[PDB]
Structures are given as C-alpha cells and as structure tokens.
Structure 1
C-alpha cells in the first residue's frame, strides 16, 4: 500500500526563495511566420496555448549550504519540497479574436435572414469569434496528462472516422479547448475549414483531472485551480454532403422549396463574456501546505512542472507600417498590417528542505515507487517533449524577507 510522504520524509526549518524574473514571449497569435526553409522566424505565441514550465532546482545533496550539521550525509539524503508558489502576470486584461477567412458556414439558423445562401460549390465565409474563457494552474513533479478525441482503430471513402479517447502528455504550445471540443482537428476534419485559423491544424487538449487525481502516487498534481465560462454567441449551419440523412419518421415531407431538407449540422460560436479583475486566479500566492494525493509537495528528481493557461490577457496588437511616406492621401495599398501578441510571466517559489533516512524498507519503497531516485542520489526519459525550460540552480537565496513572496510567507508561516 502507498504511504504519505510525511510518513518517511522529515521536514526541516530551512527555507529558500527562487524566482525567474521576467519571462517574455512575442510572436504571431495564429501561425508561425517563416519564409522560403521550414525554420521558424517569428514563433506562434497565443493566449490559448499551454505554458508548461520545466523548472530545475539545484541538487540539495551537492548544494553548498552555510552549515551541514542538520543532517548526517552518511545515512541521509536531501530533497526539496514546494510550500508556496505565485504566478505573476504583467500585461493588461484583454480579449483576443481569432477567425478563419474561409470558415465553413452556410447560413444563420438562429433567425430568418434577409438573404440566404444560394447553394453552389463553395459557400465559405470570413467569420471570427471570441473564444471560451479559461484559467488553470497545475503544479506537480511530473508532466501533466491531457485527453482528446482522436481517430480510433480502423469501409468506403467519406465514411465517419472511428472515434477514440487518447491520453497524451501536455506540452508547451499545445492549444487548450476553445468551445469546439477537445479533439484532433487535423485528422478528424479533412475539410480543414471547420474551425478558426489557429486550431484548424492542431489538437485541443483538456487536462485529465480524473486520471491525474486518481493515480496512485499523486506526483502529477500537488495543487490545481481552474475557471471556465462561455455562452453561445451565434447559431450557424454547416455546408457539405450530408453524412447521415434524417430519418423519415421524424418529419413530414414538404413540397416545392421545402422538398429538400436544409443542412442539419448545427454548430455554435462560443464567447467568453466579461473578463474581470475580481475573478482572476493569478497574482496571488498559493500555499501547498497539504496536497490531495500522497505526495505532499515533494519535488522528486529536483523538478517541478507549472502548467498555466490564461485567456484573460489574450489581446492582440494591431501593427501597421508604411511603404512610402510621400502619400499625402490615404491609400490601402500603401500600408501593411500585422498582428503580434506579448506574454509576461514571473514565477516565485518557496522551498523547504527535507531529509530522508535510507533504511532497507525506505529504499525498497522508493525503488518500487520510482527507481530513478536511488540512481540519482549516487538518456532523459522526458527529453522528447517541448517545455519552457526554467533554470533556478543559480537563483536560490535564504533571506526570505528580501522578496515579496518571502514577506507574505513570513507573515503567515
């Protein structure tokens, strides 16, 4: 049976403060910019992406403490334990808009309109919408897990793909669900125009809270917060050949214009409503004094993983340049337009040192839980994923009161 860390991990009264300072990212909000080579030139930085920071801590065993009388190195080892965190967001509150120049939309079904689509071969329209609002922060010593609907195990051309639920590690840059569902658009929509431009060739992953919480050791989730909201803004219709005809027992055949049924593939456009300062999750200190799982904040392997989504600062900046200044009158051809998005972060942590007695039972338990720890204490499995590497090896300071999160921690212990 699994046992809580507090049952075999002794905590000490030594605390440290580590911060990242300003972390900045600027780029296009929809797609990466590159010129003909596949190398990027301006990365894709959007308000609806996951930011998974892989934080590296100094090795406490080899760390140069001012004194070493608080433990016996011959029969004990040291590990860090997170007891406080603060995610700092700097940019002003705002709401960003994304859309597709050729969205697959036939006509508006919410209410009869003056003009209706004339059928034809291509009815795609230029449509944009604001997305579902989200805010989540997961902290753990292992990568988070997400779930999405992808193509299942494998007929005629155009038949409905099999549908399956897949779990995969969330990475930096993975798009969050946006009101169209958590699904693998690239493969489940061969049309390539069902959803806005920034997700039509990407996967929208949603955290697997059930799986992460229910796992035996609770490494993946010490603490987590979430907030979501959305309401339908407009009700639209889809175009294309009908996959399955409506059963003839659900309606009575018409005559004349109504002889042919209109498309019944309805889809709404989400909307985040208001972003307000009272509903914010960030810029506040979260105390991890007691976690849900068995891992009570121990950072096994000298690592942390802070996943953040914040769509309440997703304002894109219109940006224009003039080809020539000789024009005294405005001309559309004379000005080039652009888009950009800026993200600002600042992570503060409070770490409490802990020591572990290496008895036979403890060693066997630690080996069963994860064999890597014992080898460490004397290739990287996670070095196939993209994380925002954050290095704090040279940024530990023991005088807590010198920093704001340190002062807050001291006021409350």
Structure 2
C-alpha cells in the first residue's frame, strides 16, 4: 500500500540553505501574567525550560520560486517539493539547572529515615518547598506536528477517578513530564497543591513515540533524539484522607502511640542530576540521509515541524529592584522577580526534488493527502499554537556562506 518516497520523488543536484536568525523567549518560568482589566491579553508570557518548543517552519513554494534556471524540470508534467537533508538546532544560553516549587506544597513528613508515631496532620500542613525536575533533551523533525500522550480523567468500590490515556497534538508551550508522570494535574489533582505551581494547573505531555513510529506514511518522525535522566532525591507523604486504606493482611495493627495509622500515600521528589557539555544533543549537525519511516524527509505542504525540549539551559535569573534606598538593608525595601530566557538558532539545508506526475503517482498522492495535489494546481493546524518560523525570504543557494552549509559541503564531499 505505502511505498518509500525514494521510489516516486526524483532528487536533483540543487541545494539551498535556510537559516532563521536568533529566536528569543523571555518570561516568567512559573506562570503567565495577564493584563487587567483585559483578563485576556498576556503581558509576560510563561517561558520555562520544561516547555515544548514546536517550531512551524514555513518554506517557500518551489513551484513559484524564482530560480535562475528552470531547465532542470518540466512544469507541464512535474512538480517540485523541498527535502530536508541537513539540520542543526542552535542553543545559545549557558548550561544550568533551574528549580520550581510551591509555597503550599502538600508535604507532611520526610519518610526517609525517621517518621515515628504518633502523627496526624491538622487541617493545613502544606509547606513551601522547591525541587529540580527530571532532565530531558529531545528533538523531533517531521512535516506533521508530533502526537503526545497524557493521562486524564476517564469515565464502584473506590472513589478514585478513572484514568484514560489521551492522544493530542503537542503545541508550543506545553509542559513536558517532570518526574510526576504525564498527566492532567488540573483535573486529576483537585487540591492544586501536590505538584509545583508551573504544572499544578497544566497538562504534562510525553511524545507517543510508538504511535508516531507506527503510522503508515511516517510523516511525524523523520528523525529524533532523546536523552532523559532522573533519580529520587527525597521521600515524602501526602496529607489528607487516604482514599485506599492498606488492607488488613499487609500489617499487624498497633496500639497506644501506634494506634492511629499514618498516611501511606508516598510520593518522591525527582532530580535530573548533573548536566554536562558532553551529553548535549544540540549545536551539532544532523544529516537526514535515510529515515526509518517511508517519508525520507520530504516536506509536503512546504512546511516543517521541529520539536525541541532542552532542560540543560533552565537557569532562572533572579532580579531585584530597590524600592526605597536606605543606609541599612531592609527586606521591605526590595522586590524580587524571576525571569527565564531561551535562545534558539535553527539552521536547515534543503534539497530540491521533482515528482513526475503520472496517473499512478497522482492516485497515490491523492489517497495520501488530497491537499498536496490541490495546492500544486494540477489550514486545520491554525487552531493550535506554534512558534512560527518564516523562512520564505531566508533561502540561499550559497551554502559555503553559512556554518551548516560549509559543514554540508565537507560532509557530502562537494
């Protein structure tokens, strides 16, 4: 049914470089700040190292592109399309680790060494704690937005909410899993206090690698890299009513001080250990020679999708303003703010391709995607939020005038 793109897409000797300039995002790493009384316009966006970066790269239409010589193909029976052969995801900020927390984190006791009896929380025993998240690096490249998975509230001896595994398109700004799982914390944790504030009212998504790899045409994952790591830093338990009590066959009942059983609703705090330059996935070129899927880097629709997660540059800068100048230090004389920045530099090398439009090939392309033939003269993604990267006026045939272009000339022997 499905065939490789190498069987009906003819490669040419024409190569072009396309590089977006430096992309910056500066905001509050924990929450967005909206402008009153607008209650809809955001003045300071939420920019965190635990966010997905979904770049929608817009490519110019090669069939309407101003080539200096068009004698390499026949516009009467052939159409053109771009193919991605070189890619480098540039990262500018220094290596570092940021922290996230909650002023009312639902932590009762440290259950690691000493947690004797008796013990029973009051009505409000939340604490102001912080932690460092699981370290995650990943990059996905394709002509279709990636598909992610997360657990949500689904649809009786227990009052535990039913869990359902949901698939969704990963949009720019979505939170990645931090060590507490890939779930909808806003709907599955009603107290808003079990995880830090930057995810407590958000949904953490993990890329559904199995689904995106098992799709027939392979438009989602041309190529991908991933490096995750975490360990358990501390051991705590939850405050509140234990919904599922420990059955009687797992322990001998106590008495006296041990008469009232303590909450066995444990939860750990993660830590993505150390970050190193040696483990970096970025600032290095990737050559997309042969993809594992059937689509070998063909950018249908003249568009591209680059998904990036990089927690190795999650440093949160502390800013402090002086409200009142005095000869001695007073806490009420200063205001503290927290800001986070992200610096990207996407570099691409594209290969021009031609497709002879036979009746058989037109049938295959129509069954694959009718919009491909319609646009060739022979939209639903706007409801999602992406980082638009317009490279329509960024294409250049002079490869040796750019870093990735020179690297491509050395790699291919040109």
- Give the TM-score normalised by the residue count of structure 2: 0.97
Residue 117 of structure 1 and its aligned partner are, at CA, apart by: 6.2
Q: Give, in whole Å, the separation in 1 of the partners of 2:357 and 2:121.
A: 75
Superposed, 1:5-44 pairs within 5 Å as: 5-36=5-36, 37-38=38-39, 39-44=41-46
- Write out per-residue CA displacement over residues 53-106 of structure 1, whole angstroms, 9 at most, x where no aligned residue: 000000000000000000011000000000010000000000000000000011
**Partner of residue 268, structure 1:** 268
Q: Contact 1:140 / 1:219 at 8 angstroms: preserved in 2?
A: yes
2:318 aligns with 318
SS in 2 for 1:17: strand
Match in the other structure for 1:147: 149
Residue equivalent to 2:254? 254
Give the conservation status (yes or no) of the 8 Å contact 1:105–1:123. Answer: yes
| Deviation for aligned residue 1:34 | 2.5
DSSP-derived class of the 1:190 partner: coil
In the alignment, structure 1 residue 347 sits paired with structure 2 residue 346: yes
CA distance in 2 between partners of 1:319 and 1:270 (Å): 26
RMSD across aligned positions (CA) = 1.3
SS of residue in 1 equivalent to 2:249: coil
2:54 aligned partner = 52
**How far apart, CA to CA, are the structure 2 residues paired with 1:295 and 1:233?**
42
Residue 248 of structure 2 aligns to a residue whose secondary structure is coil
Question: Which residue does the alignment assign to 1:225?
Answer: 225
Give, in whole Å, the separation in 2 of the partners of 1:359 and 1:169: 34
**Aligned pairs (5 A) from 1:175-324:** 175-324=175-324
Partners of 1:276 and 1:117 lie apart in 2 by 42
Alignment correspondent of 1:370: 369
CA contact (8 A) 2:34 2:42 kept: yes
CA distance in 2, matches of 1:119, 1:349: 57
Deviation at 1:261, TM superposition (A): 1.1
Task: Name 1:120's counterpart in structure 2.
Answer: 122
Give the drift of 1:407: 0.4
Residues 314-365 of structure 1, C-alpha deviations (whole Å, 9 max, x = no match):
000000001122x000000000000001110000000000000110000000
The secondary structure found in structure 2 opposite 1:407 is: helix
Deviation of the 1:401 alpha carbon? 0.3
Q: Which of the numbers 116, 129, 132 marks the counterpart of 2:131?
A: 129
The 8 Å contact of residues 30 and 198 in structure 1, kept in 2 or not, is answered as: yes
CA distance in 2, matches of 1:42, 1:29: 10
Is 1:406 matched up with 2:408?
A: no
What are the ranges of 5 or more consecutive residues in structure 1 without an aligned counterpart?
Answer: none
Work out the number of aligned pairs and report it: 409
Match of 1:86 in 2: 88
Tell me which of 94, 97, 105 is aligned to 1:95: 97
Shift of 1:259: 1.2
